[PDB]
RNA sequence: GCUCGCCGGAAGACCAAGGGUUCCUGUCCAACGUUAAUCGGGGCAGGGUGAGUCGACCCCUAAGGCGAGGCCGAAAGGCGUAGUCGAUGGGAAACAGGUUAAUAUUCCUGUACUUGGUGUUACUGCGAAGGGGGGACGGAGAAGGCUAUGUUGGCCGGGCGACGGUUGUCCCGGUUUAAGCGUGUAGGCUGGUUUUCCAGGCAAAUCCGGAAAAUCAAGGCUGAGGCGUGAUGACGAGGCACUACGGUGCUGAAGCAACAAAUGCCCUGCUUCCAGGAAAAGCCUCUAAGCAUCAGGUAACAUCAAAUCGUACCCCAAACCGACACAGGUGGUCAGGUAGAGAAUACCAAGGCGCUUGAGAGAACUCGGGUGAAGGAACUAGGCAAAAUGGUGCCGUAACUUCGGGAGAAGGCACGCUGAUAUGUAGGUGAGGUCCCUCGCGGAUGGAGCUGAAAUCAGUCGAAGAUACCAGCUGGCUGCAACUGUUUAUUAAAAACACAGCACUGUGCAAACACGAAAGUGGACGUAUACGGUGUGACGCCUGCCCGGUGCCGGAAGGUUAAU
RNA sequence: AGGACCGAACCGACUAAUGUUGAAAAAUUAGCGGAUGACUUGUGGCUGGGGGUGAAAGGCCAAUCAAACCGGGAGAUAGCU
């Protein structure tokens, strides 16, 4: 539920919360946690590789089953939890043999439902079965690219992938970007859309709400000196040049894909 | 002490002087 | 005002000490220069 | 068992002082200048053997050497070690 | 030595870092000390730092470093696995009193505690580099229960007043006591217990987790404080004696209660929110190979051991960083009284200082302040600076608005003391007493005593009652920027940057991109509701025409065109 | 509840005066802003010079920055003084 905040202060004037009351108001399941130390956008050389990253609230990592290998064994959904590491809510499930895991929560999933992976799985939202077992025209998520590697596609809050075709070993997918991609037909996929679809409906309201998320401020390039940026300089506001990166690469329109390895898997690019 | 003189010279010039004291560009 | 030397022996020895000099190649060349010049105190290290 | 040669090289000298005279007459404790590497057990064995007297406990401290100036040339005296040796009651020593 | 003045959330006390003998005693005054110096953080000599419990070391790990092999690289070398280092964090245990010229939770007295050993005695499943549990964790807020501590009363000892009065509703001082051990309270959490089974926890498992069934609602965990003991003790105002007048010795009264009360404790709690809040060991437990009555395990008792290093002194400073005995800078801990909302401010206590040149005189001028006739911004670039306002409670308060604000709008009234209501009220606290009880740190009742606002009425004093310190000037028009923030350390704090938001565009994951000759790493343990770049810069109404130029995208028939 | 309000600690540095061989190689006095947050602070760590970092002033990188410091090429060159 999106909740517009009352303007008792600037910084709450434009805030839209996304309140989900079904989430567990307690600590997460401890065995599935691990340390996630922050980086600052800095590599093993210590240099900043990707900018604007730093700070933010401390976050513990939740181990999430993307491979989804507990085949045949049904699992009931114990509770839904918040994951700070990602946009989608996660579900704590309990298998029959006593194993608990975290999965990505689908859209209509609630506490108490039964899910089941494997080939002999039914077709309801939550189940995971190979796309040679999945009917054409269905929306799936958490899609593997390679078999047994784990789901890599459609993991964000409201996403889904349509299955448009199948030719033997391959199925053709309609990705959320509009790209049509071939995937092997033995790769697992999970039924239904991912949960928190109204995640993009939030408004942070203020700058601190981005600093909570570790997003340091972005200096636009023309507000600099020419040694710093190509856009920099001018006596006033001057920009008489084509828009480039900080490293002198055209941004407005210039393509950067240079993978001739995966071009056979791309049916059509996005438009 | 010319060593305390070393201090004297080494850094009564490294004090660096502040600067001219008339905001005048004779421009 | 706050001046530029705020001492700490631990940081002094980790940064400029003997084993920090002997760790790397260039640090070993420093000790060879100071022995050749004939320094009494070869390093910081007491 | 500590060897007798080490026990003979542990003790250096008695330390005469007002605090030493007080501790000798009140707490029955002698104050010794000992070798620097000497431990408390080595001291207790040495006093129990070379003086033939019963040691209750040994307290130790390290004396830092002073920095002196002979003429105008700087110099530093040696660090030495000091032992408060508490004898049992009734025991006596010169 | 007597006065005076200053700090007193410090200009007092304890530490860390850092320094490194500056500590104490004797002696000296050449130099140092912004003067003299008999003095000194100065010179010279001597002395002084005592730990099983404090800290370090040590066991454990974080960020991160190193890194066998390894991968990569002209060489040097780079990264990094197993590992091994690395605190600022986790991990056993001691308190009170006395004492030195100088050390003390270290010595002494008293009373404790912890972990390892060996050794007997009983008992008998022991065992890990492995499994599980625990350690183990956020912000804010609300109270409640307490204590530290303070005040008053009581008690004891002393006093009866340099000047009117003061045997009393008078004055002064004291009224301290720990760790530990026992009790397990206010209060918080939790359903217990038994049996059977089980694709899980890399194998196993009696453990955890999960399925069943039965029985019992009542067991368990945690837990400040209190009480008792510790303690017939110690301390104790004072006295009694000697006195090197410094001291040392002996003796020693009362040692209670009520109220108020923390930012400290219960509280690593409870509630709530979103931005979703370290690890590992110690500890507990489970079994594996192994061992089979041996080894080992816990239980008691005894005994032994607990090493080594630091400990002096300054530590918001004359001892640290500033070249100085420099108006600078420096992290943590303690937090008395009166007034006060208060850690502000004023005066004081404990305690510590009077800032290492003074003496005069009382010109101009300068510095920092005080007051000012009449006028009241006429000054000036400009009301710069000054002056003024200033508190609590109540009344009342405009345009406009994003309906929150504006707004403390503006403006105004009251404010002291005494008495009465009421010899001190409402309220708070809560005793005795009585009753009940599955009986205790219990439950009712009860109201003593203590504490104690605020209001009204009457009176009264002064020029003035928020009397001192403290403590908003206000309003009107308008430009810019939405806002809070940031910035040129050392002439620029702004209209500049950032910002939430908007849009374009790239990117399908071995992502783009970026650092790297490379390996690799970040992005990201993320996957297009994501990430990067660019521009704009809340919100509201909007964002029009031009693709000729320059770019970019798409095209591939033709022309031209490289190495070969 | 709040990048909410007033306001000490704390952080900062808007104005004026002093001072300018200073008490001080940027401070004092009187006022000033924020003051539960994009806060601040201790300890330790990492990023290295055409490189870092930068809420971007060409700011900061040991009182030094339109390319640090030290040593070396090196007695650079100097139609200039
Ligand atoms: Mg960015
Ligand atoms: Mg932006
Ligand atoms: Mg920007
Ligand atoms: Mg600029
Ligand atoms: Mg350029
Ligand atoms: Mg222009
Ligand atoms: Mg133009
Ligand atoms: Mg002892
Ligand atoms: Mg010691
Ligand atoms: Mg005097
Ligand atoms: Mg005073
Ligand atoms: Mg000396
Ligand atoms: Mg002295
Ligand atoms: Mg002396
Ligand atoms: Mg003289
Ligand atoms: Mg003199
Ligand atoms: Mg001296
Ligand atoms: Mg340890
Ligand atoms: Mg590591
Ligand atoms: Mg390495
Ligand atoms: Mg190697
Ligand atoms: Mg280690
Ligand atoms: Mg530590
Ligand atoms: Mg002392
Ligand atoms: Mg474990
Ligand atoms: Mg927390
Ligand atoms: Mg009390
Ligand atoms: Mg009188
Ligand atoms: Mg009289
Ligand atoms: Mg009294
Ligand atoms: Mg007790
Ligand atoms: Mg001390
Ligand atoms: Mg002090
Ligand atoms: Mg002085
Ligand atoms: Mg000073
Ligand atoms: Mg006070
Ligand atoms: Mg004050
Ligand atoms: Mg005068
Ligand atoms: Mg005046
Ligand atoms: Mg006048
Ligand atoms: Mg007048
Ligand atoms: Mg005029
Ligand atoms: Mg005028
Ligand atoms: Mg003014
Ligand atoms: Mg004024
Ligand atoms: Mg105008
Ligand atoms: Mg602004
Ligand atoms: Mg600043
Ligand atoms: Mg800054
Ligand atoms: Mg400036
Ligand atoms: Mg300024
Ligand atoms: Mg990668
Ligand atoms: Mg702009
Ligand atoms: Mg346009
Ligand atoms: Mg065009
Ligand atoms: Mg083209
Ligand atoms: Mg605020
Ligand atoms: Mg000021
Ligand atoms: Mg404020
Ligand atoms: Mg410029
Ligand atoms: Mg500088
Ligand atoms: Mg350079
Ligand atoms: Mg250059
Ligand atoms: Mg040459
Ligand atoms: Mg030359």
From Swiss-Prot, chain A:
Residues with N6-acetyllysine modification: 241
Listed name of the protein: Large ribosomal subunit protein uL2
UniProt organism field: Escherichia coli (strain K12)
Domain of life where this protein originates: Bacteria
Molecular function terms, GO-annotated: RNA binding; rRNA binding; structural constituent of ribosome; transferase activity; zinc ion binding
UniProt key word Ribosomal protein: yes
Similarity-based family: Belongs to the universal ribosomal protein uL2 family.
Annotated PROSITE patterns: RIBOSOMAL_L2
Additional facts recorded: This protein can be partially replaced in vivo by its H.marismortui (HmaL2) or human (L8, from the 60S cytoplasmic ribosome) homolog.
A Pfam family reported for this protein in Swiss-Prot or TrEMBL: Ribosomal_L2_C
Swiss-Prot record, chain C:
BP terms from Gene Ontology: cytoplasmic translation
Molecular function in Gene Ontology: structural constituent of ribosome
Key word Ribosomal protein present: yes
Entry keywords, A to Z: Ribonucleoprotein, Ribosomal protein
A Pfam family recorded for this sequence: Ribosomal_L34
Gene3D superfamilies in the cross-refs: 1.10.287.3980
Stored InterPro entries: Ribosomal_bL34, Ribosomal_bL34_CS
Gene Ontology CC annotations of this record: cytoplasm; cytosolic large ribosomal subunit
Subunit structure and binding partners: Part of the 50S ribosomal subunit.
Family from the record: Belongs to the bacterial ribosomal protein bL34 family.
Protein name as annotated: Large ribosomal subunit protein bL34
Gene designation: rpmH
């Amino acid at each position: 539920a999106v909740v517009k905040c009352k303007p008792t202060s600037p910084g709450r004037r434009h805030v839209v919360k996304v309140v989900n009351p079904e989430l567990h108001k307690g600590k997460p399941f401890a065995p599935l946690l691990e340390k996630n130390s922050k980086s600052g956008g800095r590599n093993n050389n210590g240099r900043i590789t990707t900018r604007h990253i730093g700070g933010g609230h401390k976050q513990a990592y939740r181990i999430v089953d993307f491979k989804r290998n507990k085949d045949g064994i049904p699992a009931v959904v114990e509770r839904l939890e918040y994951d700070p590491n990602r946009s989608a809510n996660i579900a704590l499930v309990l298998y029959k043999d006593g194993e608990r895991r975290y999965i990505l929560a689908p859209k209509g999933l609630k506490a108490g439902d039964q899910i089941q992976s494997g080939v002999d799985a039914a077709i309801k939202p939550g189940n995971t079965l190979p796309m040679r077992n999945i009917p054409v025209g269905s929306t799936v998520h958490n899609v593997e690219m390679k078999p047994g590697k784990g789901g890599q596609l459609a993991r964000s809050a409201g996403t889904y992938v349509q299955i448009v075709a199948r030719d033997g070993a391959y199925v053709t997918l309609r990705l959320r970007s509009g790209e049509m991609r071939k995937v092997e037909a033995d790769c697992r996929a999970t039924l239904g859309e991912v949960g928190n679809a109204e995640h993009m409906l939030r408004v942070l309201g203020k700058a601190g709400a981005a600093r909570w998320r570790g997003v340091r401020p972005t200096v636009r390039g023309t507000a600099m000196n020419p040694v710093d940026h190509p856009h920099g300089g001018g006596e006033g506001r001057n920009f008489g040049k084509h828009p480039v990166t900080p490293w002198g690469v055209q941004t407005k329109g210039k393509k950067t894909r240079s993978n001739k390895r995966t071009d056979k898997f791309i049916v059509r690019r996005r438009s | 002490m010319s060593g305390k003189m070393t201090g004297i010279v080494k850094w009564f010039n490294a004090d660096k002087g502040f600067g001219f004291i008339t905001p005048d560009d004779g421009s | 005002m706050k001046r530029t030397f705020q001492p700490s022996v631990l940081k002094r020895n980790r940064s400029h000490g003997f084993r920090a000099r002997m760790a790397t190649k260039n640090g070993r060349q420093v000790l060879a220069r100071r022995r050749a010049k004939g320094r009494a105190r070869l390093t910081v290290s007491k | 068992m500590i060897r007798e040669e080490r026990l003979l090289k542990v003790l250096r000298a008695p330390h005469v002082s007002e605090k030493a005279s007080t501790a000798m007459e009140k707490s029955n404790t002698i104050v010794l200048k000992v070798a620097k590497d000497a431990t408390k057990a080595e001291i207790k064995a040495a006093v129990q053997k070379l003086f033939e007297v019963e040691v209750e406990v040994v307290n130790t401290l390290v004396v830092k050497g002073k920095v002196k100036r002979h003429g105008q040339r700087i110099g530093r005296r040696s660090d030495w070690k000091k032992a408060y040796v508490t004898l049992k009651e009734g025991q006596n020593l010169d």
